[PDB]
Amino acid sequence: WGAQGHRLVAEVADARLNPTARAEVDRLLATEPDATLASIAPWADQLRAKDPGLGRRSAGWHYVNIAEDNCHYEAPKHCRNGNCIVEALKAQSTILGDRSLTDGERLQALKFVVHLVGDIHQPMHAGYAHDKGGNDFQLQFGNRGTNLHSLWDSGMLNTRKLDDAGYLPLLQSQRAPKLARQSNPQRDPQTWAEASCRISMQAGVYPATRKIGDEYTERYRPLAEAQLRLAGENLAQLLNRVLGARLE
Ligand SMILES: Nc1ccn([C@@H]2O[C@H](COP(=O)(O)O)[C@@H](O)[C@H]2O)c(=O)n1
Numbered sequence: 041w042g043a044q045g046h047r048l049v050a051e052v053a054d055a056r057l058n059p060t061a062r063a064e065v066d067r068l069l070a071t072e073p074d075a076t077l078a079s080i081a082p083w084a085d086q087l088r089a090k091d092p093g094l095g096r097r098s099a100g101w102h103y104v105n106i107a108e109d110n111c112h113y114e115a116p117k118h119c120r121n122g123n124c125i126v127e128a129l130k131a132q133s134t135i136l137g138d139r140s141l142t143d144g145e146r147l148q149a150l151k152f153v154v155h156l157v158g159d160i161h162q163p164m165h166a167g168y169a170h171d172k173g174g175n176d177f178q179l180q181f182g183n184r185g186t187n188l189h190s191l192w193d194s195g196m197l198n199t200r201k202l203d204d205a206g207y208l209p210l211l212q213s214q215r216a217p218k219l220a221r222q223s224n225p226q227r228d229p230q231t232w233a234e235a236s237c238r239i240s241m242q243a244g245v246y247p248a249t250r251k252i253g254d255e256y257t258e259r260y261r262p263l264a265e266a267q268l269r270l271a272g273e274n275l276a277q278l279l280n281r282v283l284g285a286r287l288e
Pocket residue numbers: 041042043085089102159193
């Protein structure tokens with residue numbers, strides 16, 4: 041997602057946190073003055089842009105290209121050295137839940153988790169290696185060029201012309217998505233990447249024309265918005281499991 045998609049996923053999640061998870065998130069955020077779950081949500085993309093070390097090393101953590109294998113993820117094939125969103129979200133979830141670590145180390149893991157639960161719900165972040173998740177699939181949207189990746193990250197969301205205050209209650213107004221009964225931090229990332237990949241491969245998502253506009257938006261913007269709500273709900277479920285109560 042673009043910055044607004046990331047923040048919306050965090051805003052949807054923030055409202056669903058159980059009291060134990062809410063208190064812990066607020067403790068980790070407090071280590072960084074003025075940080076909120078929304079404000080950190082785009083941080084991992086800024087790190088990629090600005091940091092020629094960890095930013096360059098983390099770039100592959102934002103996606104996993106499995107559509108050529110019909111959305112059947114295999115870690116040794118698609119995620120050599122753990123450099124993809126499935127393995128990165130798993131490890132950062134483990135790190136976030138490690139209470140022996142400093143609040144500073146856990147806040148950094150929270151920044152990655154908030155971001156990656158967002159990206160792993162953007163269909164094009166689980167799409168084709170051939171066109172780099174749509175980045176190399178150029179098209180005309182209205183009268184100006186974009187690419188199919190950008191169109192799903194932000195192009196269609198931008199057509200609402202809402203700030204977060206306007207967009208958040210629209211996502212909350214949607215029918216409740218189907219979640220797993222329970223969070224499994226080690227297994228859900230693959231399940232989510234595969235589900236996102238299956239949307240990238242749905243009839244029409246790749247259009248049969250170079251030029252698209254309001255017809256594409258009216259059919260697919262609802263699916264992009266369903267994925268934001270689903271990401272936000274999945275992110276709260278994950279935070280509630282990893283940062284929730286530890287009795288016994
Ligand atoms: N041409 C581009 C494409 C993306 N980007 C950045 O990448 C972000 C999206 O990264 P993800 O694909 O990881 O969602 C955008 O919010 C923007 O900051 C950019 O700065 N220039």
